[PDB]
Amino acid sequence: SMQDPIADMLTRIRNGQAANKAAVTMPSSKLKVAIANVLKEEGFIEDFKVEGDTKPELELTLKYFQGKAVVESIQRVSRPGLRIYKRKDELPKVMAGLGIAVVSTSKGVMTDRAARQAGLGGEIICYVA
Amino acid sequence: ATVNQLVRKPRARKVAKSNVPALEACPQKRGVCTRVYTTTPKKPNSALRKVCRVRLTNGFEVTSYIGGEGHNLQEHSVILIRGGRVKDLPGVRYHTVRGALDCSGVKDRKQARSKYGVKRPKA
RNA sequence: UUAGCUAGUAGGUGGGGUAACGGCUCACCUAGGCGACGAUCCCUAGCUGGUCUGAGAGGAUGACCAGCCACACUGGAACUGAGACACGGUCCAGACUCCUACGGGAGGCAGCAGUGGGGAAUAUUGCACAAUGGGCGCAAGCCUGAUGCAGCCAUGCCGCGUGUAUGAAGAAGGCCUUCGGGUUGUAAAGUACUUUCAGCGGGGAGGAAGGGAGUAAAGUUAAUACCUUUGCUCAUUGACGUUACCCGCAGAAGAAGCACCGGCUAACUCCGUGCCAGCAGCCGCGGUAAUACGGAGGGUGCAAGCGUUAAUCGGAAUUACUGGGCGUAAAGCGCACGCAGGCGGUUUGUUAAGUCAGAUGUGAAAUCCCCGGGCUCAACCUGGGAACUGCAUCUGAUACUGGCAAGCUUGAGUCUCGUAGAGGGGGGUAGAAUUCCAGGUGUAGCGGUGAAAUGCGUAGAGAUCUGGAGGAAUACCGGUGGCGAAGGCGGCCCCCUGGACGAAGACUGACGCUCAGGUGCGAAAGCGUGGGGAGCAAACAGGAUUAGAUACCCUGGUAGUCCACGCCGUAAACGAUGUCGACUUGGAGGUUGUGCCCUUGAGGCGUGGCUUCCGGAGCUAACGCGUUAAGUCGACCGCCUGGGGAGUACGGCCGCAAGGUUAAAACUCAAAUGAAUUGACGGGGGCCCGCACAAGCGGUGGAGCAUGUGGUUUAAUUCGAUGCAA
RNA sequence: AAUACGUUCCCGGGCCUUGUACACACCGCCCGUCACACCAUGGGAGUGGGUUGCAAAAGAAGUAGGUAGCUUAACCUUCGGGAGGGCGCUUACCACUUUGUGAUUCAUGACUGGGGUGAAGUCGUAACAAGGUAACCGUAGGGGAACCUGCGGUUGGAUCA
RNA sequence: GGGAGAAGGCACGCUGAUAUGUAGGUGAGGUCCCUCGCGGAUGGAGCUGAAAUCAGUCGAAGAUACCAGCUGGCUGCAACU
Numbered sequence A: 001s002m003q004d005p006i007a008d009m010l011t012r013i014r015n016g017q018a019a020n021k022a023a024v025t026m027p028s029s030k031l032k033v034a035i036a037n038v039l040k041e042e043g044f045i046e047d048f049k050v051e052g053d054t055k056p057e058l059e060l061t062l063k064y065f066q067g068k069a070v071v072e073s074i075q076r077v078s079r080p081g082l083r084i085y086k087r088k089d090e091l092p093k094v095m096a097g098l099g100i101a102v103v104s105t106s107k108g109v110m111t112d113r114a115a116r117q118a119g120l121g122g123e124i125i126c127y128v129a
Numbered sequence B: 001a002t003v004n005q006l007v008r009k010p011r012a013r014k015v016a017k018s019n020v021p022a023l024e025a026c027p028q029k030r031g032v033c034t035r036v037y038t039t040t041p042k043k044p045n046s047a048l049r050k051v052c053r054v055r056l057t058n059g060f061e062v063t064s065y066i067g068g069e070g071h072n073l074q075e076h077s078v079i080l081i082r083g084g085r086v087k088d089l090p091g092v093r094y095h096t097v098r099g100a101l102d103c104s105g106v107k108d109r110k111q112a113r114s115k116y117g118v119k120r121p122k123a
Numbered sequence C: 001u002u003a004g005c006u007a008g009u010a011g012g013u014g015g016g017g018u019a020a021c022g023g024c025u026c027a028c029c030u031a032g033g034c035g036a037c038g039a040u041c042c043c044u045a046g047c048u049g050g051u052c053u054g055a056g057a058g059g060a061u062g063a064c065c066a067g068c069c070a071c072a073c074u075g076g077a078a079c080u081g082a083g084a085c086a087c088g089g090u091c092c093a094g095a096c097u098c099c100u101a102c103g104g105g106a107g108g109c110a111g112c113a114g115u116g117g118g119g120a121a122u123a124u125u126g127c128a129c130a131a132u133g134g135g136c137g138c139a140a141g142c143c144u145g146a147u148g149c150a151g152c153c154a155u156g157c158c159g160c161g162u163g164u165a166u167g168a169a170g171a172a173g174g175c176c177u178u179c180g181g182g183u184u185g186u187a188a189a190g191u192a193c194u195u196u197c198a199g200c201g202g203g204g205a206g207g208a209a210g211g212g213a214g215u216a217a218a219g220u221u222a223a224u225a226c227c228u229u230u231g232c233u234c235a236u237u238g239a240c241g242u243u244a245c246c247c248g249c250a251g252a253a254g255a256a257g258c259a260c261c262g263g264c265u266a267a268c269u270c271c272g273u274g275c276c277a278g279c280a281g282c283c284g285c286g287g288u289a290a291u292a293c294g295g296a297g298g299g300u301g302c303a304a305g306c307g308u309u310a311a312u313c314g315g316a317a318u319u320a321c322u323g324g325g326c327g328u329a330a331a332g333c334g335c336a337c338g339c340a341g342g343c344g345g346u347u348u349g350u351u352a353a354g355u356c357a358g359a360u361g362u363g364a365a366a367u368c369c370c371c372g373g374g375c376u377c378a379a380c381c382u383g384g385g386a387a388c389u390g391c392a393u394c395u396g397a398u399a400c401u402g403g404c405a406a407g408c409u410u411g412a413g414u415c416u417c418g419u420a421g422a423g424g425g426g427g428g429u430a431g432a433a434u435u436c437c438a439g440g441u442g443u444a445g446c447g448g449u450g451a452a453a454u455g456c457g458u459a460g461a462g463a464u465c466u467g468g469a470g471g472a473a474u475a476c477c478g479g480u481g482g483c484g485a486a487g488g489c490g491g492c493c494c495c496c497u498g499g500a501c502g503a504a505g506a507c508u509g510a511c512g513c514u515c516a517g518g519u520g521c522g523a524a525a526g527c528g529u530g531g532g533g534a535g536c537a538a539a540c541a542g543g544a545u546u547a548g549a550u551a552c553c554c555u556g557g558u559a560g561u562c563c564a565c566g567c568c569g570u571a572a573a574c575g576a577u578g579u580c581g582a583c584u585u586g587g588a589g590g591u592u593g594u595g596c597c598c599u600u601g602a603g604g605c606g607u608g609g610c611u612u613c614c615g616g617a618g619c620u621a622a623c624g625c626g627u628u629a630a631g632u633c634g635a636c637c638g639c640c641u642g643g644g645g646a647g648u649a650c651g652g653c654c655g656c657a658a659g660g661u662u663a664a665a666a667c668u669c670a671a672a673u674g675a676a677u678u679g680a681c682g683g684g685g686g687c688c689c690g691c692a693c694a695a696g697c698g699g700u701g702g703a704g705c706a707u708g709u710g711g712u713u714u715a716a717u718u719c720g721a722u723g724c725a726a
Numbered sequence D: 001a002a003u004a005c006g007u008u009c010c011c012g013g014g015c016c017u018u019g020u021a022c023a024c025a026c027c028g029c030c031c032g033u034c035a036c037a038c039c040a041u042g043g044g045a046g047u048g049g050g051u052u053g054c055a056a057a058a059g060a061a062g063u064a065g066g067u068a069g070c071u072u073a074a075c076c077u078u079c080g081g082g083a084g085g086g087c088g089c090u091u092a093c094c095a096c097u098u099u100g101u102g103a104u105u106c107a108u109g110a111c112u113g114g115g116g117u118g119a120a121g122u123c124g125u126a127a128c129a130a131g132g133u134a135a136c137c138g139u140a141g142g143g144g145a146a147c148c149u150g151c152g153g154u155u156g157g158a159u160c161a
Numbered sequence E: 001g002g003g004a005g006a007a008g009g010c011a012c013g014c015u016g017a018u019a020u021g022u023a024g025g026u027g028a029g030g031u032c033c034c035u036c037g038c039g040g041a042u043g044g045a046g047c048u049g050a051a052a053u054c055a056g057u058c059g060a061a062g063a064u065a066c067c068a069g070c071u072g073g074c075u076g077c078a079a080c081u
């Protein structure tokens, strides 16, 4: 069944991106919306919207550069079968800092960089480069 | 594969099975010569290889090679054996230590003497 | 290949008990307590700091130093004491040994030496309490196999030496050589020169602080006694010890071996040997040139060591947490249901266990690491730091996970009406054919094979027509058609019944996915009882083939194949591809729903389910897979860890049996394996050539002789040529 | 001189293609019984040890409880003895030990089974090509051996003219 | 089904207490109903009475006599009565 909708989100991005799709859409959720926010703010997607009230559909506008996908890799780290948590001084960095790790903290979802600078650790949701 | 699965049944390294069990993790063992004979080897080789059956101080009885050209060994010879198989002689997994106990050195050796129990010739 | 364990057992009351809480103990009462988060039982084992290895994560490990525990010949016991159920105490019992005048006694090295024994293997029955530390004493001191030292062993680590410089046609000798020369080789001899270390003489730190006599001052006190503290002087204390270290003497004098040189791998030649003798970590060397055996010369690598063996980790991503796999290589359980378990859509509030932050305590010292210091350097010793990535308490943060509460409708169900189907079970029934029975016609064969024979027929077969019995299976339809979880399901009709799919809207409100153990299903053969028995056919008999022919072929033919009720539980049970869900370009078909369109044609435009063939990206060792994934992801399960041994043995469970299920080890090899490539080959195929066949003419094989060969003979019948190609 | 339509058939060969477990390449590879030697292992009337459950029997020393007999310097005494102690006896616990019957594990055992390994041996030729009867899987029966045969299943079968 | 009474173990007399005789068995007077009897209910008197635990006690010995299985292991044969 559909027991990890975040992996599903990652994957819908990854596959539509690989399929040079202009956009991708998925059932929404606050947690997805919090991740989409980080992606956009770090320039991995154009923009996003959620539409509807009772059955909210979230939509991500993908991004391309040299007839290439801006998103090179996008992988699930922590997951329902194996939760991954890190401390502030243990926070991974992707591509030596060129990519990012999405981290969920007591102060909401942010990048490894952000959480690092704010003295926090959290659940490592994914890597993106 | 699953994490869950490993959590129920951990990775379990295979225990190495030895090639010289009769030694029981000793560098050599002592033993009496039970039979002293020759035997022919395996494809593609051909010879009369000197071997002996040896009852060791720990009860094990094994066949052991008697390397070098010439040896003066017989039944009731007390010898020292070490690890080391003879490849074209299946079953043979030990070597006799030339020039220890009742086993004499190889006669007239000049090169590699210490592997054949031969004193340095006055010269 | 251990699933159940437990009567002081778990708790309660009260008495007793301990230094103290306590089933510690006893009485009474309750009937609990433990266990798949692994109890019980079985095997093994002292735990740690740390050690070795590894980039790390890990793996392996627990000598030496330090911390804790346990033991003191074996089993049991308490006595004394602050402390013991006592390492050189006591008592009892056991095992064993020693003394004895025979009546009786005595002892316990796992303290330090030492002995026997075992072993591949591990040291002296040494000196001293001078130093540090322990016991006693006011002290002096006495005791201290703790300790400090010395002896033994290359066991390891570190340091140094075994000389330095000069020395050429470059000698002699050796070795190779095409006899020109090359090499050993500045190596040696010669020439100067140095003297560490070992030898011998001479001198001489430090480890020494104290303690002892006196003296003086203070605190004491009646007191200058004594006592004690602190200054002063005098004479003294070192086992090591022939110390470290320094100076002098003699002379290169006393000090170099081990393995290797085929590839991996630094180092090549000759002679000897000849599948022998032998080498060998792996491949693999050895039958006349062996850089691989053995010797030599030469060379390479190490060096007071060098090799071999043993042993841990590494390389090994080869148990893969970091960090792998299961279509064809090892690996998807034959299939489904499902408890425990793992995981779980979306919103709000709450909680604050997980997670995160901070603070505090702790994480012994030594070790490791960093910067310094001390021994002539180094090993070694040592100061300070950093590190101990861990644990615990408190206080916070609330995004994610968990708990709690209310929900939500998209997941999942329920409802209605229809559709297709060899889905299952039971009961009827049909026409074709075989075999058989009964007759008519007919007459000499039928049958079978490559050829035959066995077999059948004048008791009239076979052939033909007619009537009847019986069993088994259902041509055509029929199809990369359909249905089912898999196994598997096919004439027609009815009855009972499961699943799938479509349309529309209503209802329930995460009720879901997966599933170790458990349960059920599960081709054929096989088993048990009773039926049934046409055809087919293990076994068996007969006929053939063949060198043989326990076969393939023929003539027969029993079990079985069929029915009922039980058993068995396996197959290449296969897509050799586990289940569920989400996502990712296309083309042509098959099948089956359904909405729309002058139905105006056997159509035109959509929209679901299943399915076949291609193919795109991507994936893959390749082959291939490719929206029915072997692509991109997630949840859960099963399984693999080189070949043989072995799906074997032993144990357990199961079965009437056959057997099934779970599932090892020794031993042995350096392979086994997958896909694809170039050949060759095939009693595979296609196309095509040659006096290859076919069409012709003349021959050889018979005869006599010539001739060659074989054979036979011989003193010799000389040697060679032997399928086409003698 | 005769005769040739033609390439189905024999023999040698060429090209394309296919299957292969062949590569000193079909005079290839390879399978099992049987014979001989060696290795480890299972079974096996049994033989000998270790550990252990249950049921009982046993009861040294010690400590505690009880205490009539015996005995007693310190305290009490009205001088007769008292209190208290010791010994002895006795009860509880319990070591050694004994008996019966089970369980488990190690070693070993006449003989027997299969397995592995050997330069060459004997019999055949089962698989690899359509391997000359396509092979294999499960099962059952048969046979010196590889195997053969029946039933169902699979393609991991050549050729389809 | 069996093997099985496998094998092997423990208890066993007497006296007292629990209880001057218990659990149980039997059942009268009385009371009440009655379709009245050889009736039903209630009631528990009297009678009878094993067994257990605790404590004590005699003997060498408590199933004391008579009475009343010996047990186990391997193997031939016939299934069995």
Ligand SMILES: [Mg+2]
Pocket (backbone or CB within 6 Å): none
């Ligand atoms: Mg109490």
Ligand SMILES: [Mg+2]
Pocket (backbone or CB within 6 Å): C045
């Ligand atoms: Mg031990």
Ligand SMILES: [Mg+2]
Pocket (backbone or CB within 6 Å): none
């Ligand atoms: Mg020591």
Ligand SMILES: [Mg+2]
Pocket (backbone or CB within 6 Å): none
């Ligand atoms: Mg020591």
Ligand SMILES: [Mg+2]
Pocket (backbone or CB within 6 Å): none
């Ligand atoms: Mg220690």
Ligand SMILES: [Mg+2]
Pocket (backbone or CB within 6 Å): none
């Ligand atoms: Mg003791």
Ligand SMILES: [Mg+2]
Pocket (backbone or CB within 6 Å): none
């Ligand atoms: Mg005491």
Ligand SMILES: [Mg+2]
Pocket (backbone or CB within 6 Å): none
């Ligand atoms: Mg102790």
Ligand SMILES: [Mg+2]
Pocket (backbone or CB within 6 Å): C088, C109
């Ligand atoms: Mg002692």
Ligand SMILES: [Mg+2]
Pocket (backbone or CB within 6 Å): none
């Ligand atoms: Mg010895």
Ligand SMILES: [Mg+2]
Pocket (backbone or CB within 6 Å): none
């Ligand atoms: Mg010369």
Ligand SMILES: [Mg+2]
Pocket (backbone or CB within 6 Å): none
């Ligand atoms: Mg000197």
Ligand SMILES: [Mg+2]
Pocket (backbone or CB within 6 Å): C208
């Ligand atoms: Mg001094």
Ligand SMILES: [Mg+2]
Pocket (backbone or CB within 6 Å): none
């Ligand atoms: Mg080289």
Ligand SMILES: [Mg+2]
Pocket (backbone or CB within 6 Å): none
């Ligand atoms: Mg060598």
Ligand SMILES: [Mg+2]
Pocket (backbone or CB within 6 Å): C290
């Ligand atoms: Mg040679």
